[PDB]
Amino acid sequence: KGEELFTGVVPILVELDGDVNGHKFSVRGEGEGDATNGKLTLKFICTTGKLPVPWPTLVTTLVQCFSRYPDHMKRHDFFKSAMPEGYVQERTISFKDDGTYKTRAEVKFEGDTLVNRIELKGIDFKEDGNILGHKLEYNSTWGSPGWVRLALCLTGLVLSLYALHVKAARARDRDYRALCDVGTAISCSRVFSSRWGRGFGLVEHVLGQDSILNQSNSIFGCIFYTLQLLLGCLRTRWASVLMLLSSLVSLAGSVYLAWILFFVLYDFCIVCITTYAINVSLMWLSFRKVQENSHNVYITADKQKNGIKANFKIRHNVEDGSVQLADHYQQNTPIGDGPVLLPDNHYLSTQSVLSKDPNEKRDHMVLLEFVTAAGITHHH
Ligand SMILES: CC(=O)C[C@@H](c1ccccc1)c1c(O)c2ccccc2oc1=O
Numbered sequence: 495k496g497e498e499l500f501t502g503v504v505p506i507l508v509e510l511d512g513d514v515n516g517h518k519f520s521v522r523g524e525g526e527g528d529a530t531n532g533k534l535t536l537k538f539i540c541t542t543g544k545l546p547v548p549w550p551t552l553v554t555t556l557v558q559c560f561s562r563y564p565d566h567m568k569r570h571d572f573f574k575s576a577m578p579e580g581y582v583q584e585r586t587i588s589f590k591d592d593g594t595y596k597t598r599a600e601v602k603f604e605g606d607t608l609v610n611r612i613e614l615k616g617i618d619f620k621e622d623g624n625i626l627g628h629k630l631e632y633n634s635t636w637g638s639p640g641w642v643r644l645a646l647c648l649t650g651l652v653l654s655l656y657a658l659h660v661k662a663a664r665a666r667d668r669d670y671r672a673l674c675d676v677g678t679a680i681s682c683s684r685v686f687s688s689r690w691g692r693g694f695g696l697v698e699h700v701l702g703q704d705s706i707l708n709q710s711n712s713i714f715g716c717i718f719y720t721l722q723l724l725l726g727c728l729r730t731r732w733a734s735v736l737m738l739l740s741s742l743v744s745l746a747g748s749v750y751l752a753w754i755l756f757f758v759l760y761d762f763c764i765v766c767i768t769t770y771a772i773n774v775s776l777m778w779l780s781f782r783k784v785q786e787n788s789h790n791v792y793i794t795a796d797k798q799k800n801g802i803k804a805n806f807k808i809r810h811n812v813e814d815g816s817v818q819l820a821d822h823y824q825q826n827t828p829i830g831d832g833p834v835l836l837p838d839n840h841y842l843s844t845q846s847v848l849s850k851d852p853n854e855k856r857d858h859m860v861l862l863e864f865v866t867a868a869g870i871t872h873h874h
Contacts (some may be wrong), residue, residue: 507609508603509522514593515618515626524537527557534865549623555567557608559577559608580600580602581600585597641814649679653772664683690862709746748769791824795838801827808822839873843867
């Protein structure tokens with residue numbers, strides 16, 4: 495019956511009393527929620543002055559009853575079924591190599607308003623870590639790619655440019671010797687100028703040799719490493735998936751060319767092995783990156799407490815291009831004694847957009863959120 499209260503837009507009040515390493519603070523948020531579209535719109539203000547932690551670390555703590563459950567999943571919506579009596583949501587949030595938040599909140603209807611009242615205690619944070627030191631990005635669209643990605647892409651670029659220089663000197667001068675041409679046993683310019691050194695050897699078979707796509711592999715390389723470095727500076731999803739696909743094609747071509755270098759050409763190419771290692775590293779970084787941009791809350795039932803349990807990882811962007819992991823363990827227990835929906839295993843998909851209000855001089859955070867339930871299973 496609790497679902498009836500969520501057709502339409504519902505006003506939202508959030509109140510948090512917090513203590514992090516002895517620094518006491520309070521947050522109040524106000525807004526509205528539209529469960530039909532899984533849309534939350536809220537504004538949060540630190541009422542005690544300045545927040546002692548970065549705002550992104552409080553997003554998960556600061557109303558999953560506003561998630562959109564598709565029709566075929568209606569009976570797996572524990573959060574709405576607990577209303578109006580509400581539920582207790584308790585969490586432990588472990589920041590990797592740093593402190594811990596412990597939160598207890600009551601989410602319930604007071605009059606017409608959905609109210610989330612939170613108590614938060616943070617402990618064991620280091621004063622110059624990413625949290626207390628405020629080293630996390632807020633909502634930057636252009637940011638750092640990290641010195642690992644910069645090193646990989648710049649090295650790959652230098653190697654591609656060098657291979658271009660070698661090809662442009664050998665085709666000009668037959669007797670030219672590159673640095674990676676050592677004696678008569680080791681030769682890189684012989685590898686570059688083979689049929690596989692252009693279009694990976696397979697563009698001439700499919701598009702013909704006349705094609706503009708039948709370029710030297712180092713052209714694909716300059717474009718690839720420049721593209722990887724550029725997309726590493728972005729924070730959206732399309733940059734991430736594009737990164738994954740491009741690094742996957744790059745990995746396939748690199749494995750093929752590695753099979754050609756040995757076993758077929760039987761040559762020693764030092765720049766080639768270097769590039770292979772680069773492309774493996776960028777493959778790993780891209781796979782990891784796709785893992786890191788997905789906020790998915792994994793929900794299972796708890797029949798002992800007649801509630802639910804949830805596990806998920808959140809990764810906050812650090813200003814230097816690295817990531818800060820925050821492990822989330824969650825449990826929800828109904829406040830009343832009426833019946834609730836004990837769901838099958840599923841997950842919630844969440845997209846958050848943080849912003850600033852130019853007419854708010856208090857330390858604050860404007861939050862827009864879209865949450866939809868998915869991945870329903872009868873299993874586990
Ligand atoms: C290292 C280079 O600059 C060119 C290298 C390469 C490696 C990965 C992806 C594209 C290009 C390269 C070789 O491995 C290679 C190996 C066997 C036969 C031809 C080759 O030519 C290359 O372009």
